[PDB]
């Protein structure tokens, strides 16, 4: 698994891979690791598939109840904390979760919280989680700027997952892209890694080690 | 978390805390502030198990803020430290204990004295001129034992603190990504933004 | 089922009276006279064994009860209420004191515990007050000899000497004339017997009178020897013969 | 005294019948269901001119497809609304879909008779629950403290209800437009209200399939009031 | 006064008026009886046919407890069912712990204590039934009758309901004329007659006869309902005696 | 069922008054008068025992003045047994606070806690309220010397001088007349005894009918001392102030 | 546990226990709230039947729920403490979970919810308290003023009064408060609040308390002398 | 009088007035009819509206594929009791792979209602129920009273003016019991029965509610134009 999310001038880019493994066995290449909590909030899924799916869907229900009661969009701070407080109650029982709660509100701007099953809740600009996180960080760190365009930011996220998908055995399948704006998230397609790799190799001149 | 240091000088308490947050293989963040303001003249830094540190710190913060509002009065650093100790002493025999070590730096406005309290996750409290948690003391205490004076200025305290951090950066295997330094005195709490 | 009386049965009336407590005190007033006198070297408590039938064996009915080795109790009012209070008083002396401090409670604190139980029956849900007034005599190392009265309300007062029940008003006047701060225990017993004779109609002897003292330690009643610090109970119930001996010198 | 769950000799629960009297003292609320949507309107009835009337919240959103208006002891409605919102959201969580308007109403009505010696008394408020679902289209329900709910083409509750209901009897037909329903609620509210109806002492709302539940702006309602005045002067 | 408004309150007489009012509900019910025979017991009950629309033989009144005890009652039918449900729980727990089926005297006290418990508090109402029950155990046949107060005794014959006086008189004749005893088959016949005779107090509507029995020789000590030919034979015997 | 016998101790009257609280206050108006006077250098607590006897053991007797901790004491007016229940709870609260914060409990926090307990009995539980009014005399380093009172409603207020129990109307008028802000403890001692002497229903005010206490910084240097007066000491101060 | 239904409907559809709780509010000392353009002022009556009072330590009528919100009340003093404590706990709980202080409306809604709950729960009586809750939402400069009552209904007010003789001071406010132009300054708002209490109070001495709440957690209570200057200036203009 | 304050109090003649008052609520309710043959069992119910804008209150509730009832009285109480039946039918199927006998269903309803008549704090149910079903012993019809009394019948009626329908069924007994293998004729007999209880109003398309269960017929409810055939 490889997922990243980073803040920039135009909001947030979320990029994930699509592979699921049960040992060496590749169970799926078409897994949705981004969860559409609601039209404004996204969550990433690492660790326990069910734990992430179940509780971030539940989170969407809590966010909906909040805005019904308060007549106002829930903050990313408040939404992330509902989830982190919940998993903290279960600490020790064996939940496995590594997620980035991503959103864009008026009062906060673009915001990302890394939330984790041992109770961690961290606000930050760039996060990368999963078995292939180190590969993606390398591409991110060397190319990241705040003043990236939406087009270049989307590509950077796509390219960073590709880096991980190549090297990490447990990452691959396809790349899912999202762009989070103040008016909500925008999906930017499913990209097969097989086809994407060759395309990027030729156009970019990278991966000279690999024969194509 | 890793390194938290404290030093009580003439007229203030200085807390230094590392900025790194490491989740196993990667350093996820290099600007983390491992501290909470409990009251205008009381600061608490913390280190221990992930999640429990912030949960405990914010829980304490909420309780002291509640007391402040109810009584329209700021508890003394001693009173706050005793409350914190009891919570940790209670916690150690719980089903799942808070694995959190803290330093409490406060300026007592009644006595006009700075005060530094060191409390570990067992509820072991000691008032000290300077303190630390984890391995931080192993590298820094020999320097503090040598140079420390009770009549030091805040600037001299910061210089002695720099020497401690330099020794840590030299001999510690882990990269803790520098420290955030905060000063607690009669005027309240402020952060040294260049260290 | 379930106890659905979770509300107070004793409440303030418009005049500020707690009716059920007043009525409990009225029941105490109808009760047989009992008294207590404190001397310099002891305390005496006494009452009449008003036998309900001559076929009844009145020795099996104990109106004067040992609470601890150094504390005794007598009552006026409802006998059954007294009996259960004695059971509770004996137990609370252990649970709330002896099992904690390894020694028996001082008189004033045991009285305080009994008083608390009686107070709670005056406020707790679905119960009536106890229909007794107690006289508790006792000794302890740091307070010496003492005598306390406990009423249905839970209020308690220390006395040099007093009486409760039927002829208490006349008895207290009798005690005021005779009591001084130089009385020896035998003098107090003598005065107790004199005072008690006034309120008794029929037979007046060791079989119709119940009398106990808090006095010297009784090593002969300890049941074992070998521990110097353990010297025996100060509570002692006088025998029928011992009472009759003092009725000749009356 | 007597049990809270006691039956009268006529076979009615005393407390339920008495709560119905409290609802009669409440401010008027009206609902009209059409094939283009359901309209909900209320009388705000501020007790003083210093009371900021936009803080009077007698029309409330339960979900995007379900709205609700209240009449009677309006404080009692808060836990009913909370339950309704929770039930709507919970069902979506369990079934990945919108809940049926009837099912929501039934869930609210289940609370009603949970009183005795559970809560100490029935609710002192009646609700008009309006919404849309794919199976039964636009719907309007009247939820009572008896636990009974009736579906209505149009319904009025509160102090001016019987006068309003007689008016709704004559005016409602199966071909009403949404605009016609809006004016009709305004017209009947104006008829039964003590004070003169304006955009500050009355409130409109609607539920449509496209846009969901919406509370009308005071500016939007003010225009509909002006449109009403002119068409009544037109004959 | 006001002593009769609340259960478990002693009147100045020393009476529990609420229990006495429960008896009135019993006296208002249909007639039910019990006859103790040589090696068992017979139970019979009057079932009033309120309407032609009642399905014959379907609304069964007599109830079995365990496999050896029969129970019949007069008064509020639901109260009787509640008592039998408890009785079945008592019998089950007894057999669970002690293996052997509950003896009849043991079972009698279990019902007795439970009914008596409903005279101790004002938060419950006394039972509006008198229950006739019994069966065969290791010590032989036993017949009991239990009142709303919780009072019960053993009986040679028992009767309750609206026609209890008539029934009792008939039962007393059988006791006098048969000191040696009555057979199970005789008792079934006699039970039919007595219910028919007791039906004079309920003569407005016609009725349906229901009989059951436990006998060591006839049913192997198990409770069974009298059905078909044996029931008809008893009905014929009963009809012959009233004419 | 049981409802029939329920007095409903926690209901409003049509006028918006709590029946039981009002009736408990009526009870307290017959209790012996207790007075508290706050001075710049200490606090005085004076209280009248109710019609006593010559056979009552006074030196071991306590019905009015109770110690809650080393810094705080109370004067009681009402049912003594009810008061002891609350007093023990207050003593425990003070110790809980001391264990938690390692500082002596501030006077108002203790007063608020007891007053909240009284309040609870008026709103829920269906039990009768405590027929007790307290005068709290205490010291802490925030507000210094403080006097408070609480009554069965659970309402509490602060005072420079205050009375509870019998003849409070007459007592309060006398205190209001002679009290001044720059007053000292020795003057306050005299005022308290003079006020009791005039308001008492007894023929004369004697030592055996009184309980007396002072809270002074007349403790050697920067500390506070509680003094529960002995029978002989009450007799002496009665002679000193010229009442006997 | 004690489960008795104390708050119940009567044949005419009234809950008398809730209505009698309002009668307790009617007896309580007068409280008034007035919001200006950039402030809210809470005025409170102190009955002068109690002198020899220690005003340093006596419970003040206005209570801070958080650094930015205050609560005053009319009715049973002991009852109000329970609502104040609950509100203070909820304020900190909100900061802990939402990471933002309560809005004035949210805090009002919570307190009102507690009051309502005590009108249909077994074994409890309603609070004999009405409250005025005032302050500013976080990072907002719009003044907020709400009212609650024993039944649990709540609403926003440009100006409002509760307690004894509140009918009279509401009469004053209704003719003296202009919505198109609220008291533009702190001075004007305090003056109008003191004026409204002077219709009812008696002596303008220690009988009037004034608390001013401004945006960004700026809350201060006026002293005797400061209020006395308003009292002086008002009557000198009145002598004309 | 002095003995009707709660369900825990007998009167001096041994009556339970709260139960009798609960029985009175049924008499105020709209009429519903039940009848059966040897192959089928039918419910017919006259639904009641609040006014001309309102819907007609539903009267028939399905409990299982082989069982269901019609109500008269407090509708929420019918919902509670029908929910309980649904659970008991369901427990029998899940645990014992067994369809719950109609007679046993009657016994369970009796016992549930009885507990509310002997305890303090509670109240009797204010609804009457007509349960029909087809089990291993054929077609069945039950009448439930909130006193606890449950009775198995060939036919019956409860609610306002139910006496007219009940007399008709008592006359027709020998005819309708023989209507085997003909669902339409059995319903006709039920519609004709409920007609003997109508005054001023007649059976319309949104007024009438019919249910049927039988040998090869799951419990199904007919409303709207599905009952126009029988009007």
Swiss-Prot record, chain C:
Keywords, ordered alphabetically: Cytoplasm, Isopeptide bond, Nucleus, Proteasome, Ubl conjugation
Instruction: Enumerate the subcellular locations listed in this protein's record, separating them with semicolons.
Output: Cytoplasm; Nucleus
Q: Which InterPro entries match?
A: Ntn_hydrolases_N (IPR029055), Proteasome_alpha (IPR050115), Proteasome_alpha-type (IPR023332), Proteasome_asu_N (IPR000426), Proteasome_sua/b (IPR001353)
Q: Where's the Glycyl lysine isopeptide (Lys-Gly) (interchain with G-Cter in ubiquitin) crosslink?
A: 108
GO biological process per UniProt: proteasomal ubiquitin-independent protein catabolic process; proteasome-mediated ubiquitin-dependent protein catabolic process
Q: Per its UniProt record, what SMART domains does this chain match?
A: Proteasome_A_N
The entry's cellular-component GO terms read: nucleus; proteasome complex; proteasome core complex, alpha-subunit complex; proteasome storage granule
SUPFAM superfamilies, A to Z: N-terminal nucleophile aminohydrolases (Ntn hydrolases) (SSF56235)
Name the principal localization, coarsely classed: cytoplasm
List the CDD domains hit by this protein, alphabetically.
proteasome_alpha_type_2 (cd03750)
- Specify whether Nucleus is a keyword of the entry: yes
Keyword Cytoplasm among record annotations: yes
What is the similarity comment for this entry? Answer: Belongs to the peptidase T1A family.
Q: What other note does the entry give for this protein?
A: Present with 7060 molecules/cell in log phase SD medium.
Complexes and interactors: The 26S proteasome consists of a 20S proteasome core and two 19S regulatory subunits. The 20S proteasome core is composed of 28 subunits that are arranged in four stacked rings, resulting in a barrel-shaped structure. The two end rings are each formed by seven alpha subunits, and the two central rings are each formed by seven beta subunits. The catalytic chamber with the active sites is on the inside of the barrel.
- This chain belongs to the protein called Proteasome subunit alpha type-2
- The source organism is Saccharomyces cerevisiae (strain ATCC 204508 / S288c)
From Swiss-Prot, chain D:
One GO term describing the cellular component: nucleus
Question: Any keyword GTP-binding?
Answer: no
Q: What is its main location?
A: cytoplasm
Say which domain of life the source belongs to: Eukaryota
Nucleus in keyword set: yes
SUPFAM superfamilies referenced in this protein's UniProt entry, alphabetically: N-terminal nucleophile aminohydrolases (Ntn hydrolases)
Q: What is the recorded name of this protein? A: Proteasome subunit alpha type-5
Instruction: Write down the species.
Output: Saccharomyces cerevisiae (strain ATCC 204508 / S288c)
UniProtKB/Swiss-Prot annotation, chain E:
The biological process GO terms on file are: proteasomal ubiquitin-independent protein catabolic process; proteasome-mediated ubiquitin-dependent protein catabolic process
Where in or outside the cell it occurs: the entry states: Cytoplasm; Nucleus
Please tell me where this protein is predominantly located. cytoplasm
Q: Name one GO molecular function term.
A: mRNA binding
Describe the task this protein carries out: The proteasome degrades poly-ubiquitinated proteins in the cytoplasm and in the nucleus. It is essential for the regulated turnover of proteins and for the removal of misfolded proteins. The proteasome is a multicatalytic proteinase complex that is characterized by its ability to cleave peptides with Arg, Phe, Tyr, Leu, and Glu adjacent to the leaving group at neutral or slightly basic pH. It has an ATP-dependent proteolytic activity.
Q: What does the subunit section of this Swiss-Prot or TrEMBL entry state? A: The 26S proteasome consists of a 20S proteasome core and two 19S regulatory subunits. The 20S proteasome core is composed of 28 subunits that are arranged in four stacked rings, resulting in a barrel-shaped structure. The two end rings are each formed by seven alpha subunits, and the two central rings are each formed by seven beta subunits. The catalytic chamber with the active sites is on the inside of the barrel.
Question: Would you tell me the protein name for this molecule?
Answer: Probable proteasome subunit alpha type-7
Q: Which organism is the protein's source?
A: Saccharomyces cerevisiae (strain ATCC 204508 / S288c) (Baker's yeast)
UniProt gene name? PRE10
Swiss-Prot record, chain G:
**Organism for this UniProt entry:** Saccharomyces cerevisiae (strain ATCC 204508 / S288c) (Baker's yeast)
What is its biological role? The proteasome degrades poly-ubiquitinated proteins in the cytoplasm and in the nucleus. It is essential for the regulated turnover of proteins and for the removal of misfolded proteins. The proteasome is a multicatalytic proteinase complex that is characterized by its ability to cleave peptides with Arg, Phe, Tyr, Leu, and Glu adjacent to the leaving group at neutral or slightly basic pH. It has an ATP-dependent proteolytic activity.
Tagged with keyword Nucleus: yes
> Which keywords does this Swiss-Prot/TrEMBL entry list?
Cytoplasm, Nucleus, Phosphoprotein, Proteasome
Stated family: Belongs to the peptidase T1A family.
Q: Which SMART domains match?
A: Proteasome_A_N
Cross-referenced Gene3D superfamilies: Glutamine Phosphoribosylpyrophosphate, subunit 1, domain 1
Q: What is known about its subunit structure?
A: The 26S proteasome consists of a 20S proteasome core and two 19S regulatory subunits. The 20S proteasome core is composed of 28 subunits that are arranged in four stacked rings, resulting in a barrel-shaped structure. The two end rings are each formed by seven alpha subunits, and the two central rings are each formed by seven beta subunits. The catalytic chamber with the active sites is on the inside of the barrel. Interacts with CIC1.
Q: Which NCBIfam families match?
A: PRK03996.1
Q: Which SUPFAM superfamilies match?
A: N-terminal nucleophile aminohydrolases (Ntn hydrolases) (SSF56235)
Q: What is this protein called?
A: Proteasome subunit alpha type-4
Q: Which residues carry this modification: Phosphothreonine?
A: 58
| Localization in the cell | Cytoplasm; Nucleus
């Amino acid at each position: 698994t490889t997922m990243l999310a980073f803040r920039f001038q135009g909001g947030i880019i979320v990029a994930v891979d699509s592979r699921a493994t049960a040992g060496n066995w590749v169970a799926s290449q078409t897994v949705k690791k981004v969860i559409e909590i609601n039209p404004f909030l996204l969550g990433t899924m690492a660790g326990g598939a069910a734990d992430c799916q179940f509780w971030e869907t539940w989170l969407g229900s809590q966010c909906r109840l909040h805005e019904l009661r308060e007549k106002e969009r829930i903050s990313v701070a408040a939404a992330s904390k509902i989830l982190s407080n919940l998993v903290y109650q279960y600490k020790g029982a064996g939940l496995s979760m590594g997620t980035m709660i991503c959103g864009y509100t008026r009062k906060e701007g673009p915001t990302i919280y890394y939330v984790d099953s041992d109770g961690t809740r961290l606000k930050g600009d760039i996060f990368c989680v999963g078995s292939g996180q180190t590969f993606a960080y390398g591409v991110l760190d060397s190319n990241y700027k705040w003043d990236l365009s939406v087009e270049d930011a989307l590509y950077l996220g796509k390219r960073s997952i590709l880096a991980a998908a190549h090297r990490d055995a447990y990452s691959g399948g396809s790349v899912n892209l999202y762009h989070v704006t103040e008016d909500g998230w925008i999906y930017h397609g499913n990209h097969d890694v097989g086809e994407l790799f060759w395309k990027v190799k030729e156009e970019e001149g990278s991966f000279n080690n690999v024969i194509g | 978390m890793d390194i938290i240091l404290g030093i009580r000088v003439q007229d203030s308490v200085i807390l230094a805390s590392s900025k790194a947050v490491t989740r196993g293989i990667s350093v996820l963040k290099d600007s983390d502030d491992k501290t909470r303001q409990l009251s205008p003249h009381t600061l608490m830094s913390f280190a221990g198990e992930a999640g429990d540190t912030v949960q405990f710190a914010e829980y304490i913060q909420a309780n002291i803020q509640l007391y402040s509002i109810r009584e329209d009065y700021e508890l003394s650093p001693q009173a706050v430290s005793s409350f914190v100790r009891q919570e940790l002493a209670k916690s150690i025999r719980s089903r799942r204990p808070y694995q959190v070590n803290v330093l409490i730096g406060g300026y007592d406005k009644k006595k006009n004295k700075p005060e530094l309290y060191q409390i570990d996750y067992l509820g072991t409290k000691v008032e000290l001129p300077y303190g630390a948690h984890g391995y931080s003391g192993f590298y820094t205490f020999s320097l503090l034992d040598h140079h420390y004076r009770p009549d030091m200025t805040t600037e001299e305290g910061l210089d002695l603190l720099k020497l401690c951090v330099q020794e840590l950066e030299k001999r510690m295997p882990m990269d803790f990504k520098g420290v955030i330094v905060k000063i607690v005195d009669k005027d309240g709490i402020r952060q040294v933004d260049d260290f | 089922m379930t106890d659905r009386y979770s509300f107070s049965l004793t409440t303030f009336s418009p005049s500020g009276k707690l009716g059920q407590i007043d009525y409990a005190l009225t029941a105490v007033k109808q009760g047989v006279t009992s008294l207590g006198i404190k001397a310099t070297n002891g305390v005496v408590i006494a009452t009449e064994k008003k036998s309900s039938s001559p076929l009844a064996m009145s020795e099996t009915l104990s109106k004067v009860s040992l609470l601890t080795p150094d504390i005794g109790a007598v009552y006026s009012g409802m006998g059954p209420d007294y009996r259960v209070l004695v059971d509770k008083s004996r137990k609370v002396a252990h649970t709330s004191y002896k099992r904690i401090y390894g020694e028996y409670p001082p008189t004033k604190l045991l009285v305080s515990e009994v008083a608390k139980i009686m107070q709670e029956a005056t406020q707790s849900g679905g119960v009536r007050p106890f229909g007794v007034s107690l006289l508790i005599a006792g000794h302890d190392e740091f307070n010496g000899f003492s005598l306390y009265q406990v009423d249905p309300s839970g209020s308690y007062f220390p006395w040099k000497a007093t009486a409760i029940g039927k002829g208490s008003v006349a008895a207290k006047t009798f005690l005021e004339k005779r009591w001084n701060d130089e009385l020896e225990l035998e003098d107090a017993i003598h005065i107790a017997l004199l005072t008690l004779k006034e309120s008794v109609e029929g037979e007046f002897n060791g079989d119709t009178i119940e009398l106990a003292i808090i006095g010297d330690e009784n090593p002969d009643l300890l049941g074992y020897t070998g521990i110097p610090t353990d010297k025996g109970p100060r509570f002692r119930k006088l025998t029928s013969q011992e009472i009759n001996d003092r009725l000749e010198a009356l | 005294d007597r049990g809270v769950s006691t039956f009268s000799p006529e076979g009615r629960l005393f407390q339920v019948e008495y709560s119905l009297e409290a609802i009669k003292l409440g401010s008027t609320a009206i609902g009209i269901a059409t094939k283009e949507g359901v309209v909900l309107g209320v009388e705000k009835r501020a007790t003083s001119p210093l009371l900021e009337s936009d803080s009077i919240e007698k029309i409330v959103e339960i979900d995007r497809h379900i709205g609700c208006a209240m009449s009677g002891l309006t404080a009692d409605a808060r836990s009913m609304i909370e339950h309704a919102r929770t039930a709507a959201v919970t069902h979506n969580l369990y079934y990945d879909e919108d809940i049926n308007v009837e099912s929501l109403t039934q869930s609210v009505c289940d609370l009603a008779l949970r009183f005795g010696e559970l809560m100490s008394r029935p609710f002192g408020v009646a609700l008009l629950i309006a919404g849309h679902d794919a199976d039964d289209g636009y719907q309007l329900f009247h939820a009572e403290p008896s636990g009974t709910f009736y579906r209505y083409n149009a319904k009025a509750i509160g102090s001016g209800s019987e006068g309003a209901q007689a008016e709704l009897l004559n005016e409602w037909h199966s071909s009403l437009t949404l605009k016609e329903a809006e004016l009709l609620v305004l017209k009947i509210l104006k008829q039964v209200m003590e004070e003169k109806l304006d955009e500050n002492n009355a409130q409109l709302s609607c539920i449509t399939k496209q846009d969901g539940f919406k509370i009308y702006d005071n500016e939007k309602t003010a225009e509909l009031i002006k449109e009403l005045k002119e068409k009544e002067a037109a004959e | 006064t006001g002593y009769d408004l609340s259960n478990s309150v002693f009147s100045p007489d020393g009476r529990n008026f609420q229990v006495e009012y429960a008896v009135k509900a019993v006296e208002n019910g249909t007639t039910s009886i019990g006859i103790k025979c040589n090696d068992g017991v017979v139970f019979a009950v009057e079932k009033l046919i309120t309407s032609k629309l009642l399905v014959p033989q379907k609304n069964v009144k007599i109830q079995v407890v365990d496999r050896h005890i029969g129970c019949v009652y007069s008064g509020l039918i639901p109260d009787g069912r509640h008592l039998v449900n408890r009785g079945r729980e008592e019998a089950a727990s007894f057999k669970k712990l002690y293996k052997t089926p509950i003896p009849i005297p043991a079972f009698a006290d279990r019902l007795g204590q439970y009914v008596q418990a409903h005279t101790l508090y004002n938060s419950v109402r006394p039972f509006g039934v008198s229950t006739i029950f019994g069966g065969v155990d290791k010590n032989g046949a036993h017949l009991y009758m239990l009142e709303p107060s919780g009072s019960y005794w053993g009986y040679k014959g028992a009767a309750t309901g609206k026609g209890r006086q008539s029934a009792k008189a008939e039962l007393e004749k059988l006791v006098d004329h048969h000191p040696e005893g009555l057979s199970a088959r005789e008792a079934v016949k006699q039970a039919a007659k007595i219910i028919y005779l007791a039906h004079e107090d309920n003569k407005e509507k016609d009725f349906e006869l229901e009989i059951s029995w436990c006998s060591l020789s006839e049913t192997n000590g198990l409770h069974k309902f009298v059905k078909g030919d044996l029931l008809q034979e008893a009905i014929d015997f009963a009809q012959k005696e009233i004419n | 069922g049981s409802r029939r016998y329920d007095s409903r101790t926690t209901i409003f009257s049509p006028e918006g008054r709590l029946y039981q609280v009002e009736y408990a206050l009526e009870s307290i108006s017959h209790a012996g008068t207790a007075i508290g006077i706050m001075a710049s250098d200490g606090i005085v607590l004076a209280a009248e025992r109710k019609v006593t006897s010559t056979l009552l053991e006074q030196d071991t007797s306590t019905e009015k003045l109770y110690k809650l901790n080393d810094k705080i004491a109370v004067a009681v007016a009402g049912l003594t047994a009810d008061a002891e229940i609350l007093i023990n709870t207050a003593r425990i609260h003070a110790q809980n606070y001391l264990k938690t914060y390692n500082e002596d409990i501030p006077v108002e926090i203790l007063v608020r806690r007891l007053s909240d307990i009284k309040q609870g009995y008026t709103q829920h539980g269906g039990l009768r309220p405590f027929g007790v009014s307290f005068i709290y005399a205490g010291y802490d380093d925030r507000y210094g010397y403080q006097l408070y009172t609480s009554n069965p409603s659970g309402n509490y207020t602060g005072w420079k001088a205050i009375s509870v129990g019998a003849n409070t109307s007459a007592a309060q008028t006398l205190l209001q007349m002679d009290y001044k802000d720059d007053m000292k403890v020795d003057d306050a001692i005299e005022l308290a005894l003079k006020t009791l002497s005039k308001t008492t229903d007894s023929s004369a005010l004697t030592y055996d009918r009184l309980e007396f206490a002072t809270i002074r910084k007349g403790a050697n240097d920067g500390e506070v001392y509680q003094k529960i007066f002995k029978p002989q000491e009450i007799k002496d101060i009665l002679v000193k102030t010229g009442i006997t | 546990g004690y489960d008795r239904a104390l708050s119940i409907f009567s044949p005419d559809g009234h809950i008398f226990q809730v209505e009698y709780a309002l009668e307790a509010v009617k007896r309580g000392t007068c409280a008034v709230g007035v919001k200006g353009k950039n402030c809210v002022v809470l005025g409170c009556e102190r009955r002068s039947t109690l002198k020899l009072q220690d005003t340093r330590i006596t419970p003040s009528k206005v209570s801070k729920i958080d650094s930015h919100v205050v609560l005053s009340f009319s009715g049973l003093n002991a009852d109000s403490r329970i609502l104040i404590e609950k509100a203070r706990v909820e304020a900190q709980s909100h900061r802990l979970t939402l990471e933002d202080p309560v809005t004035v409306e949210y805090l009002t809604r919570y307190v009102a919810g507690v009051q309502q709950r005590y009108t249909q729960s077994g074994g409890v009586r309603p609070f004999g308290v009405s409250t005025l809750i005032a302050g500013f939402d976080p990072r907002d400069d719009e003044p907020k003023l709400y009212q609650t009552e024993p039944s649990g209904i709540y609403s926003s007010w440009s100006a409002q009064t509760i307690g004894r003789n509140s009918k009279t001071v509401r009469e004053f406010l209704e003719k003296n408060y202009d919505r198109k132009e609220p008291p533009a300054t702190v001075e004007e708002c305090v003056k109008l609040t003191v004026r409204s209490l002077l219709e009812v109070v008696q002596t303008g001495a220690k009988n009037i308390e004034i608390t001013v709440v401004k945006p960004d957690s700026d809350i201060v209570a006026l002293s005797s002398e400061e209020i006395n200057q308003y009292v002086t200036q008002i009557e000198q203009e009145k002598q004309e | 009088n002095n003995y009707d304050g709660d369900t825990v109090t007998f009167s001096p003649t041994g009556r339970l007035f709260q139960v009798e008052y609960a029985l009175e609520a049924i008499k105020q309710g709209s009429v519903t009819v039940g009848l059966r043959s040897n192959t089928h069992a039918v419910l017919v119910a006259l639904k009641r509206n609040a006014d001309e804008l309102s819907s007609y209150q539903k009267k028939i509730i399905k409990c299982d594929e082989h069982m269901g009832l019609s109500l008269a009285g407090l509708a929420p109480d019918a919902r509670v009791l029908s929910n309980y039946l649904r659970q008991q039918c369901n427990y029998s199927s899940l645990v014992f792979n067994r369809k719950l006998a109609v007679e046993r269903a009657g016994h369970l309803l009796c016992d549930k209602a009885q507990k509310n008549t002997q305890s303090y704090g509670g109240r009797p149910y204010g609804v009457g129920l007509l349960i029909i079903g087809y089990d291993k012993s054929g077609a069945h019809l039950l009448e439930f009273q909130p006193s606890g009394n449950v009775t198995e019948l060939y036919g019956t009626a409860i609610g306002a003016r139910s006496q007219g329908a009940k007399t008709y069924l008592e006359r027709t007994l020998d005819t309708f019991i023989k209507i085997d293998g003909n669902p339409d004729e059995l319903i006709k007999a039920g519609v004709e029965a409920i007609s003997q209880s109508l005054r001023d109003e007649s059976l319309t398309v949104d007024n009438l509610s019919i249910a049927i269960v039988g040998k090869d017929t799951p419990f199904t409810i007919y409303d709207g134009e599905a009952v126009a055939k029988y009007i």
